[PDB]
Design a binder for these strands. Structure first.
Lengths: 89, 121, 119, 43, 106
RNA sequence: AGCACAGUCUUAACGAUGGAUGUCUUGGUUCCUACAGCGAUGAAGGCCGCAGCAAAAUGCGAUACGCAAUGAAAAUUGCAGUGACUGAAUCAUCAGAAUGCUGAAUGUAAACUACACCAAUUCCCUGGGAAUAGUGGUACUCCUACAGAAA
RNA sequence: ACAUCUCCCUAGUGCAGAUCUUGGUGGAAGUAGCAACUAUUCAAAUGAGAACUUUGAAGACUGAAGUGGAGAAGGGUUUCUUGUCAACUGUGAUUGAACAAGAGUUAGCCGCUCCUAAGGGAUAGCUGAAAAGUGUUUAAAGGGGUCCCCGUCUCAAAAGGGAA
RNA sequence: AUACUGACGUGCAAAUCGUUCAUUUCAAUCACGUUUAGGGGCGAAAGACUAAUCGAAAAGCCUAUUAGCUGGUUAUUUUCGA
RNA sequence: UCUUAACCCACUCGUCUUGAAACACGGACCAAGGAGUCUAGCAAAUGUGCAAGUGUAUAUGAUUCUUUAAACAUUUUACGCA
RNA sequence: UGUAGGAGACCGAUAGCAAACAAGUACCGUGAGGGAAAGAUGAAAUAGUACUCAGGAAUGAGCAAUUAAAUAGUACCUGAAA
RNA sequence: GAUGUUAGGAGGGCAAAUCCGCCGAAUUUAAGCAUAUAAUUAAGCGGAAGAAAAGAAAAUAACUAUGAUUCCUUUAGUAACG
């Protein structure tokens, strides 16, 4: 058999059954079973297992520029009332 | 020395030296004032400005007086009119001088400078 | 070029007319930039910033008008209301925290602690 | 393959735009590139 | 085990390495405690923040001779003093509700 | 203008080769001190944009390497270009304004820019006139109130 | 930037070797080798330079189960024009599927998109500490009608069905 | 994929190439989509197969598992020495 | 000092093994890195301070505040061990 | 753990966090995942190799030339051994 | 008990070092191994906070008794369990 266990097997490889995943961006969406391997996309839960430290750290808060949290920092320190400003000239 | 608020490390001071905001850049672009002027203003040292007249006290260019051309905040170098140098291709530019190496004769007067002098005296 | 206070002077029709004028000019620069011409390219940044100033001033005035419209009457629209931490919003009032039963009120009023000395 | 998906097509066009060499003027004031035959996008 | 060596009594067979703690904060912690009480006293006008305990007996055959600071005066001693529970809270004397006031001598 | 032996091995001198050693060091390291939660009022994460010349981590979000405001405050500059003699050029602070598409993600969907339904909607002017197919709302569970039905 | 033998503390403190770890480098060696697939020649042009670039003339071969056309998967600007030769194109190289600058894919009717299937995901329930395991099965639920009569939903075929 | 135990055996190839040979209308072959998952599946049974992985896949961790056993275990002089 | 000579002598080092020049095993070469440590408790040794006592524990205190994260102090039946 | 200070009888680019850096990146794996190599010219390049000659060009040389210094020319400190 | 895009509100998810719950192993030790051991540890699923939980006696004592909680020094490597 020319599709044999070894080199011959690799020629019949076509048709990727994993894709990108919108809630991941790291290639991990199994198309056939409609499920992300990495972030668990069809589930609300994000699949954040604790048995790998490397996996645990390589996505975290402070990966994604933190579009509200970054903005929130310093405000806590300042303690201005909401809607308040500096005074005019 | 006594305050424990600010680090005594080499490391923090250097980082602060390289990452300076503009007011800090202005502070470390100050030069010592002329002797009668120091008495006049009650002020040791002043931040350099565009049309100032300095005397050079250090390097191969020492003892030369002259007006400041351009100030380079980024490399922390002032340029003075009579410290020209020709380059590899013979283009003439001004030698950049760190502000430690110059003493200020006639400072330029302007509204901001007046406010600084009023603050100092 | 244009400066905020001059825009704040303007009425809403006048401010919008300026906004529209800037868009048309901005488009002309953009067309010019798209063409092989290099005549006015740097000015586009300034115009984009000018447009930004117009919009910020108009939006601030509109926001103030909305605040003026919903002066008091207990409820502003949701996201015109106080945005604060979810926790802080959830939190029990100090006024309510302070309040206490009649027997507690009697205890507090009758028996506060006092300060003292010795010989 | 021959037929395409709008998301895929956009990302591929992005990757192509990113690929092209650095402005020479930037060096007067280039670490990463892909070549299609020996490096695939891994998608 | 070998030679003249006594049998050991260590318990380091369990994973102690994440169940161990070393105190390097001691003297600074002591300073912080001092600072906290000093700040508190000063805030109270410099008035005492100290609590006056009853004298009470130490227990059983071993310590029956000895006497120490107790939990609180309680009603019979307060009644003998002519002081109310509310007064006892108001002033620096220590408070209780279930320490019996025992024998006459105490 | 002559004369050398060759090859192989060894020695010294001088170079190539190589990146050790030495010297640094806006980094790591451990400790101590200090504060310490974000989210349907839409977080974290992810995309997609956005630089005058601009690919990138950075930065920002359709007003997009910043807008406004305050405090500093005269430069900027690789080229082009933009200002001064102090709401302009530059910083820092940052409370105001703004914050695409997503994502718990929540109208039904999803290898889809696919598809419902109910409100058509916005601006300008001082009680009216103009624009635009545009913009919202409508998930599941719970609770209080109300409703009309079912003892 | 360097010492202390004056004294004394401290230590990630002394290497030839571990089929040591890591990095560089030799002898082996200008050697093994560049042998599937019948074959090239002449002249000219280009250029610094031509066995293997281009043009022409010959000779030949593929021989409709084609090194010919088309399309699916998969790849993704590899396309195309205009330049071009540091490195690459296991020989040469002016060539190039390399590098540089641009250009370029136009749909009421072709596909997808729509429909249901094998299937999958849920609601209704019910279990299970939860996580999950199940899926009309002990339901007060989408359509048609002058207040009445019907009804589990939802995604799933780029070769089935499917207007043009 | 039977044989030449052919060529090849630092390959054209971690199973290729040549010649020979079996199969060719059905228990047929092919595609795509789909199902069943790890002491589990699935198996015209060979412990076969389940992504160059199998008498128990891959990934990560308990873990620096354990090893009476193998290997290695770094300057000098002097003294006593099995 | 280096350099060849010449007379006489001169077997691969490490290694496990009673025994390796071995037809025993490891080593193409060079550079850098590269292996009895640390904690707990115990023992003897020797130094040191005190002695029928000893240690000062948690902690308190101070005219102690870059270095102070240590140093200094402890208004007569606490506890360990003896 | 996040953020902010202050530290050191710590490491000094094969070490120290995997990361002194455009590194949780490149790159590899069907995927879960796995995961690097990678700092230094000079005081000053607003001193970064002008000019000439020989070269098709690369380059080379110079009576020419910056610098204190170019067997200091950006694969730039020092530059060991093989 | 239904039904409501009725009017007003709330929950969902993320992040996890320390915190609180559940659910919950084995490598390992005994030079074997079964009880014991690892260990009410790891992984899993949940909930919180700047600390959390715990806490005002259905308590300890047998004294001349003590008198909510938490923490340290200790009892103590002891009673006890095997």
């Amino acid at each position: 058999g020319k599709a044999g266990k070894g080199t011959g097997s690799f020629g019949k490889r076509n048709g990727k059954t994993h894709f990108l995943c919108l809630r991941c961006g790291k290639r991990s969406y199994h198309l056939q079973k409609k499920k992300c391997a990495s972030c668990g996309y069809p589930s609300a839960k994000k699949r954040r297992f604790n048995w790998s430290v490397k996996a645990k750290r390589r996505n975290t808060t402070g990966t994604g520029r933190c579009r509200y949290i970054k903005t929130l920092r310093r405000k806590l320190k300042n303690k201005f009332t909401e809607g308040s400003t500096p005074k005019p000239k | 020395k006594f305050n424990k608020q600010k680090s005594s490390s080499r490391r923090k001071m250097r980082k602060a030296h390289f990452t300076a905001p503009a007011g800090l850049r202005r502070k470390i672009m100050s030069s010592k004032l002329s002797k009668e002027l120091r008495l006049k203003y009650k002020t040791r040292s002043l931040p350099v400005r565009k049309d100032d007249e300095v005397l050079i006290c250090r390097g191969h260019n020492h003892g030369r007086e002259g007006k400041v051309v351009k100030i380079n905040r980024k490399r922390y170098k002032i340029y003075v009119e009579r410290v020209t140098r020709e380059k590899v291709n013979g283009e003439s530019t001004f030698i950049g001088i760190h502000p430690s190496n110059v003493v200020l004769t006639k400072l330029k007067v302007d509204k901001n400078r007046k406010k600084i002098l009023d603050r100092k005296a | 070029n244009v400066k905020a206070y001059e825009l704040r002077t303007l009425k809403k029709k006048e401010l919008l007319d300026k906004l529209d004028e800037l868009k048309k000019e901005l488009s002309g620069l953009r067309i010019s930039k798209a063409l092989g011409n290099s005549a006015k390219n740097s000015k586009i940044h300034g115009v984009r910033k000018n447009v930004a100033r117009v919009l910020t001033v108009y939006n601030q005035k509109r926001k103030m008008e909305l605040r003026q419209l919903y002066k008091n009457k207990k409820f502003k629209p949701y996201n015109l209301r106080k945005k604060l931490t979810k926790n802080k919003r959830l939190q029990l009032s100090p006024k309510q925290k302070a309040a206490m039963t009649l027997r507690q009120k009697k205890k507090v009023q009758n028996f506060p602690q006092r300060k003292y000395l010795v010989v | 393959g021959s037929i395409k998906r709008f998301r895929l097509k956009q990302r591929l066009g992005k990757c192509r735009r990113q690929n092209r060499p650095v402005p020479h003027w930037y060096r007067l004031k280039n670490t990463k590139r892909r070549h299609w035959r020996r490096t695939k996008l891994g998608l | 085990v070998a030679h003249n060596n006594v049998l050991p009594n260590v318990h380091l067979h369990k994973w102690w390495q994440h169940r161990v703690r070393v105190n390097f904060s001691k003297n600074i912690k002591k300073k912080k405690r001092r600072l906290l009480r000093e700040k508190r006293r000063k805030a109270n006008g410099g008035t005492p923040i100290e609590k006056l305990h009853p004298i009470v007996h130490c227990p059983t055959q071993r310590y029956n001779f000895r006497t120490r600071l107790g939990k609180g005066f309680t009603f019979e001693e307060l009644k003998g003093a002519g002081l109310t529970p509310r007064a006892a809270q108001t002033i620096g004397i220590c408070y209780d509700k279930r320490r019996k006031n025992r024998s006459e001598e105490s």
